[PDB]
Structures are given as C-alpha cells and as structure tokens.
Amino acid sequence: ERSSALSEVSLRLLCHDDIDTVKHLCGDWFPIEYPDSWYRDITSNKKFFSLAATYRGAIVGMIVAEIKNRTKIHKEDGDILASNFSVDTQVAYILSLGVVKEFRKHGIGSLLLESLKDHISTTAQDHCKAIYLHVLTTNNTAINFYENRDFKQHHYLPYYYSIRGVLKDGFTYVLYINGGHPPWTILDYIQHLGS
C-alpha cells in the first residue's frame, strides 16, 4: 500500500508555501518551539540546503542543513575538528532530518542524507571536513540510523538551565569526510608515530 513508496518519491527544495507543513512535520518529530522566523528562514533562505522528499507530491520527509566555516560552530562543539584544520575549513550542520513515521524504513532518510553528501561535494569539494548534528538522548531510532551510517558519537551535551531558556540533554554526532578528524591527544600521536 505504502510498500512501494520510494518509487513514488521526488526531491525538491523547500519554499515559503511549505511553512505550515514544515511546522506540522517537525512538531511531530520534536517537541520544540521554533519561532516563525526560523521556519521562514529555513524554507526561503538559500544559505540553507533545505530539501524535501515528497510522496505522491506531498512532503513526507526533509533534510535541512547549513554549510559553514568552522568558526561558526558553537563552542560546545568546537572540538569536533582538530586545531590543524584551518579557520577556512568548512562543516555542515544538519538542522533537521526527519521522515513521517508511516514512511520510515523505505529508504527516504538515506536518500536525503546521500543528497546532502552529494550537495556538499559539488558545493564545497574537499573543503568541508565534517557533517555534524544533534540528537536527543531519547532517540534510539535516529541514533541507530546514524551509527549505521558511520556517524560517531562525539560527546554528550548536558541539560542547560538558564534565564535564556532550557535545553534538554543530547549527543553530538559527527561524520568525518575529506580527512577530517577530532583533536588528537598525546597518546593518539604516540600511536601514529610509535607504530
């Protein structure tokens, strides 16, 4: 019924007209209060690669990412890349990846991810050295999907409580590309030089 769904899937960019759909689908995945401005920006601003997967013409999945230089990484994740990667080095952050529950396990998520990788290759060549993202600790399904796709769990991010707001805990997950890697400790060097 839905069994054949991948054969009826097309890829397109998000656009302003998609905002209400995007609110609905994102809200289903994640209980978080993004402002309208966030939705307008991700849907309409070319700084983002925002790609939808449609089934029978209706969005059933999306990936939203930003390719940016390493200085734009928030300090909590600054150490995803070693210091010997210069300030000009690029990374891609995945703001959102999701697929509608009924449509999961048909290969849509993988297709979206692959599409982003292709986009990175054409757009940034070998300059981009990591793709990174955040997952809630609770998301067993997502973690499995990413781990199976070579993403590594970089570190735990704790609950954050402040006047500015509250953040749930999470993990940063990173796929390294084009030779990227995290900072190396004394032992890491001892190993490479040693052996």
Place this chain on the structure above:
Amino acid sequence: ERSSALSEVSLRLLCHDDIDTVKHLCGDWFPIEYPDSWYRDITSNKKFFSLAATYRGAIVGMIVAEIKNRTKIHKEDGDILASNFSVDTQVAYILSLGVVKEFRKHGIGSLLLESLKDHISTTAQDHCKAIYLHVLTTNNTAINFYENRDFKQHHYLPYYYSIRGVLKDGFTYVLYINGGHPPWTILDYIQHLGS
C-alpha cells in the same frame, strides 16, 4: 509605606517550603520554564547558596548561586578566565538574582549580592576568581545594576535553536575577584611588558 522596607528585611536560606513562592517570583522576572526538579534542587540542595530576603517575613528577593571549579563552566563561557588559572580555580555562577518590583531600589539587591561576596570569602577564600552571570539583552535595569557594581560585559551569547530547545540571546557578565582576569592577547602582554 514601603519606603522603610530595608529596615524590615531579614535574610534566610531558601527551603523546600518556598518552592511555590520561588516559582511565582522567578516567573515574574523571567519567562522561563524550569522543571520542578530545578526548583527542588535550588531550594533544598546545599551545593547551592540560596538566600532569600524577606520583608515582614515574606520573601521579596533572592539570590541563588553555585561555587564550582572552573572545569564546570559551560564551554560558551570557558574563556572568562585566562588559562594560567589552574583547573582547581573556582568561580561562582549566579543562577538567579531578583527582587520584587515594588521593593526595588531599596537596597535589597545590593544586600543579596554583598552577602554572596561574603559567603565566597569565608567559603572559598582567594581560590574563587570570578563571579559570573547571564542577563537577557532586554534587561536594561539589571545591566545597569551590575555595571554599576563593577561587573563587565564579557561577551554576547546568540540565540540558540536546536532539537534540544531554544535559547534567547544574552550577555555574560563577570566580576573578577582575587586577581582573576580573562585571557590576554598578544597586545595585552605587549602592553604589560612594554610599559
């Protein structure tokens, strides 16, 4: 009427019985959703210095702070102290400082702050090197109060949007004590050595 209010003010620790009052007063200052567990912890856990100011026996102000080693500072604020301050160095973070609006400008906030400074001296001696806190960009009144009290604006903290949650923008404000200072740049050294 309220004019004489400081003469009728007493200081006491927060306790479990205060939680509903604390929710009410904090909520009036800040629009943020702390979980019940946060309130239980700040009211009852001795890891925190949580001090209330009462007028006619009722809480009209409070300060909540935690004295902690520097490794416990979140990475966004790691650079409040220079690297030559060892890992054993302590800082105090102010989780909350507020006074009920009608009772403001009677000296209650200053008293709470001074009390924390006294607590730090007896508790940590000269080991604590900074007191730091966060304010929303919107808080003109708080900024004035802190700036007048020698706190410096260390840096801007941007809006944060993620699956984990949303944070409003803010500033980190720091008072240095016992010789504490931020990292020094090449020019900063050139100046000290130079002149």
